[PDB]
Symmetry: C2
Subunit: 183 residues, 2 copies
């Protein structure tokens, strides 16, 4: 609904980027970062990945995946319940501009590196082969739609049962989904 | 990847992203998609209030199943040996959609769904009337599979040790994705 969509984008930056390539749906998996002003998303394809060939001039879709997991009706007080899935997701629409300026490419590889290198990493900076090799781009953001199915449709007690059960399950999705519902 | 490896990924990460063209815009729904025993088809269901099925029916849609994924750091090996990248596995399924409207087949797909996701313990059944109402609130469908593409980035273009040390680093990490990637690195 609101400003939580940005949070999901920044924490699940390995997006799926869907566009029409030659009149068929085409998707790439790849990190997409928000610029400081949060008005667009930067990424880069491999040049050998043909999706950029005709990615311009259309509203593409970037999907950011939050946590999900199965919710079992065996967790409620009753036989009378329907199974369901919990998840969180942010869909971003906008248009692409390919970026070839070599200063801009470098700036967006930098911001990316800072995002993913570990705090004590000494990594930072054949390399023009990393101009020949990649195709930076940006997605000027047009709209953002967020989904958060979190069983908030149910009474508070049934929700506590679901939490109690998920939080004691040794799986990432279950626990992450469990932190979400509480909030 | 290789028919079998693909279905395994589809079977183990069934919570998919289903993308169609809707009123000239790209649309995605996140829902479980199960393979039938013959593995020619993917079954799913919508909320009815979801406009995606209104026109899903005469196009090649894309069902995306997500394997594990992680950052691979160029700090885990010597200068120049590599570039910053992610490792991951996905499978993409293309097909055309068919709306299932017989309650027998709908009920059937719903049973298979319970079977697959309930714990081996379980005692949970089709023990409600409530069932009718729930069913006028969903739209069942089937994807007739035309093609399957596997997608993998696992850094198999670095020699032994470079992959051998990437493995140890990954498995020392306290994260599901990295350990998942680490296994696949065989």
């Amino acid at each position: 609904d609101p400003d939580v969509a940005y949070q999901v984008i920044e924490e699940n930056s390995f997006a799926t980027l869907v566009s029409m390539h030659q009149r068929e749906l085409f998707a790439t998996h790849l990190p997409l970062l928000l610029d400081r002003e949060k008005t667009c998303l930067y990424g880069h394809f491999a040049r050998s990945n043909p999706q950029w060939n005709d990615i311009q001039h259309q509203t593409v879709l970037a999907i950011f995946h939050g946590p999900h997991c199965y919710i079992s009706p065996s967790w409620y007080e009753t036989n009378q319940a329907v199974p369901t899935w919990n998840y969180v997701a942010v869909h971003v629409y906008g248009n692409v501009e390919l970026i070839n300026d070599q200063g801009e490419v470098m700036q967006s590889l930098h911001d990316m590196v800072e995002k993913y290198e570990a705090p004590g990493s000494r990594y930072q900076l054949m390399l023009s082969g990393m101009n020949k090799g990649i195709q930076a781009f940006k997605i000027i953001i047009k709209r953002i739609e967020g989904k958060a199915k979190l069983s908030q449709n149910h009474p508070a007690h049934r929700q506590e049962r679901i939490i109690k059960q998920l939080e004691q399950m040794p799986f990432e999705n279950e626990k992450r989904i469990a932190s979400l519902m509480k909030k």
